[PDB]
Design a protein around this ligand. Structure first.
Ligand code: PFL
Ligand code: PFL
Length: 578
């Protein structure tokens, strides 16, 4: 028995929670009730396997059990049409079918939230179904959410109500903590979506490279042999969580924290405080610890990597280990570099050793390698420096609007909603990183753009409309940013054509929050740039200036929200003029 295994390790709480998340992430459109049912039928079975370890099918692989359970509702194609197919499949992958069918953008209605007076009551009456509903909603809207981390977000979500419901001003104590969590959750989710895309679309060697750089940056004092161990394990953990195997991922993840904390003196000195607490908190801590201080007297890289005469020979012996050692050695002394830049230098070095080593005189050919690193390193520095300056003058909103115009011109085929969402997130880097010392600016900015751009890539892969996006997304994981910065204005795009249904105006806008108001304005700008790419400099503003006027007036005029229809057609006349 395996299901027996995981049960004993995670116990009832966690085991039950993880299974729900797994089920919710597979059948995102399936109602809460049904999921709870299967989860229970599923948990009950488990309990018997514990006692009798060969009873029904207790001898099974979680994949058959889980699969069959879901298939008791999936065969209902009138609800989940294309799902029934996966069910008719077999063992080798009646699952590859499921994972392949995950929606990164489910057509699930907005999740609005009941007055502080209800959530509190509902929470107190039944604390179980309240928290269960949380995970269900998150996991079903974020099919790649790092499961073990979702359990941590849950323990915090509970503590939010556990406390604020006992306030004097609940709405005051809650609202905050609830926002803060909604944001941090969308981040953790994007951070993880990139980790799964790497493994799934580029391979484990790719993820392994990213881990070596990252870990070496964080734990400079750690030895190469140690980092590899860590990289090996961490890779397996994420491979499982991304293959849909959450129970083993959670288990293995706990084992790693245990290890890392045990060999504390051998890895980092800033681990102490993470090793002193509740596991879930210990795991989230280690994963977010600050880099350790850099080892005092460190030799120069040129020594064993460009000046040694045995370079080519060692490369031939164990290239992967050699290049791994290079990356580890370069990253440990450069916490001021982003992880993609470090991977760019490593790829440039390998490429050089390849052509150089088959030469009539290596050491002569590869002897000036660091000369090619210069441009690679300066490029992001200049980009960061310049976009931060600009972001400072215009602020976040105006900056976002700049990227919006820019990016819609780059790839006009992309759907407006994605452009708006992506441009917004790109602008949010300014507030997030610009306020940092140049020593921490690049790692902050560039790696965050690797997450934001990945989101655009996974969202585009759904319905590919621009081969330029496909190319930049597929050609290189590490050069995605550089690829997109290089893109200019699509000279082959043909302007859209106005039609009524293009943009709808109903008064319903005057009720929405300040945010959804800007958003509707940004959605307008994108639609504008799609209809008038070229002609655009400052007619854009002049017009956007006009759109604001429209809303202001019509929302505060007291006619039926009629002017909306009349004046709606009025502005269109003006717009076209420009
Ligand atoms: C830090 C942040 C403001 C930033 C830096 C460099 C480049 C970009 C985009 C425009 C590619 C960016 O948003
Ligand atoms: C909302 C407003 C800015 C707008 C959007 C899309 C197209 C047009 C014209 C070109 C018809 C337009 O004026």
């Amino acid at each position: 028995s395996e299901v027996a295994h995981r049960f004993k390790d995670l116990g009832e709480e966690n085991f039950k929670a993880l299974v729900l998340i797994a089920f919710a992430q597979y059948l995102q459109q399936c109602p809460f009730e049904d999921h709870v049912k299967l989860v229970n039928e599923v948990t009950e079975f488990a309990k018997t396997c514990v006692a009798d370890e060969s009873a029904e099918n207790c001898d099974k692989s979680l994949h058959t059990l889980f699969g069959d359970k879901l298939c008791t509702v999936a065969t209902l194609r009138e609800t989940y049409g294309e799902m029934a197919d996966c069910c008719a499949k077999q063992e080798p992958e009646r699952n590859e079918c499921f994972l392949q069918h995950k929606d990164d953008n489910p057509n699930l209605p907005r999740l609005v939230r009941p007055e502080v007076d209800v959530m509190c009551t509902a929470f107190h009456d039944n604390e179980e179904t309240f928290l269960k509903k949380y995970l269900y909603e998150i996991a079903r809207r974020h099919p790649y959410f790092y499961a073990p981390e979702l359990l941590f977000f849950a323990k915090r979500y509970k503590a939010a109500f556990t406390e604020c419901c006992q306030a004097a001003d609940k709405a005051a104590c809650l609202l905050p903590k609830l926002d803060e969590l909604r944001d941090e959750g969308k981040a953790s989710s994007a951070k993880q979506r990139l980790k799964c895309a790497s493994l799934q679309k580029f391979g484990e060697r790719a993820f392994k490279a990213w881990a070596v750089a990252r870990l070496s940056q964080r734990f400079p004092k750690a030895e190469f042999a140690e980092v590899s161990k860590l990289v090996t394990d961490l890779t397996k953990v994420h491979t499982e969580c991304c293959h849909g195997d959450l129970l083993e991922c959670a288990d293995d993840r706990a084992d790693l924290a245990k290890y890392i904390c045990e060999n504390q003196d051998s890895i980092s000195s800033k681990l102490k405080e993470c090793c002193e607490k509740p596991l879930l908190e210990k795991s989230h801590c280690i994963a977010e610890v600050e880099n350790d201080e850099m080892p005092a007297d460190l030799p120069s890289l040129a020594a064993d990597f460009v000046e040694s005469k045995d370079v080519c020979k060692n490369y031939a012996e164990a290239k992967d280990v050699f290049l791994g050692m290079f990356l580890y050695e370069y990253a440990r002394r450069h916490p001021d570099y982003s992880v993609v830049l470090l991977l760019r230098l490593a790829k440039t070095y390998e490429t050089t050793l390849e052509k150089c080593c088959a030469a009539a005189d290596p050491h002569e050919c590869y002897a000036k390698v660091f000369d090619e690193f210069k441009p690679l390193v300066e490029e992001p520095q200049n980009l960061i420096k310049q976009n931060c300056e600009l972001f400072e003058q215009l602020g976040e909103y105006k900056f976002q609007n700049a990227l919006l115009v820019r990016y819609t011109k780059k790839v006009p085929q992309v759907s407006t909603p994605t452009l708006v969402e992506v441009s917004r997130n790109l602008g949010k880097v300014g507030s997030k990183c610009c306020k940092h010392p140049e020593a921490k600016r690049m790692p902050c900015a560039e790696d965050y753009l690797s997450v934001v751009l990945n989101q655009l890539c996974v969202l585009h892969e759904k319905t590919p409309v621009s081969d330029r996006v496909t190319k930049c997304c597929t050609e290189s994981l590490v050069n995605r940013r550089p690829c997109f910065s290089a893109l200019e204005v699509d000279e082959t795009y043909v302007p859209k054509e106005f039609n009524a249904e293009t943009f709808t105006f109903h008064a319903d806008i005057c009720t929405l929050s300040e945010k959804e108001r800007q958003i509707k304005k940004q959605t307008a700008l994108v639609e504008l740039v799609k209809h008038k790419p070229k002609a655009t400099k400052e007619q854009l503003k002049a017009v956007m200036d006009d759109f604001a006027a429209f809303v202001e007036k019509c929302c505060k005029a007291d006619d039926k929200e009629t002017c909306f229809a009349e004046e709606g057609k009025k502005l269109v006349a003006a717009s076209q003029a420009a």
